[PDB]
Amino acid sequence: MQLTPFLILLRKTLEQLQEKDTGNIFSEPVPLSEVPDYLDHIKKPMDFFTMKQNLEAYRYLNFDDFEEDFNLIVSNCLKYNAKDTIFYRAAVRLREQGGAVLRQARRQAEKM
Numbered sequence: 886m887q888l889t890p891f892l893i894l895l896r897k898t899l900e901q902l903q904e905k906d907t908g909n910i911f912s913e914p915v916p917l918s919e920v921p922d923y924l925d926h927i928k929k930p931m932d933f934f935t936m937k938q939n940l941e942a943y944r945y946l947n948f949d950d951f952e953e954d955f956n957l958i959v960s961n962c963l964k965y966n967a968k969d970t971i972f973y974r975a976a977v978r979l980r981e982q983g984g985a986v987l988r989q990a991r992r993q994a995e996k997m
């Protein structure tokens with residue numbers, strides 16, 4: 886596999902995942918100023934902006950490491966937020982809608 890088409894695919898896939906986050910709940914890091922206890926609960930924060938930085942830093946060289954950071958966005962939000970919140974339900978929705986984006990993207994990567 887060649888690096889350039891793979892990274893193009895990851896860029897497109899990240900854009901598609903961001904489209905599913907219609908409230909932009911996951912676009913940027915959880916603001917530690919407004920959630921002071923966040924790092925008490927979440928060992929590795931993640932968000933789509935950090936994922937973009939990691940992608941461009943060549944930190945994602947296989948689909949699993951891209952998907953692992955996506956799964957961190959979801960799992961961190963399920964962990965931190967109570968089930969009766971918009972935040973929790975948004976992570977459930979992103980897991981469902983984003984999973985479908987990821988499966989098709991991984992098949993494209995496997996054809997490379």
Ligand SMILES: CC(=O)Nc1ccc(-c2cn[nH]c2)c2cccnc12
Pocket residue numbers: 910911915916919920961962965966972
């Ligand atoms: C992605 C996420 O877990 N975000 C957040 C959870 C909880 C809170 C929060 C709820 N109450 N106080 C902070 C957030 C506040 C601002 C921005 N993001 C928040």
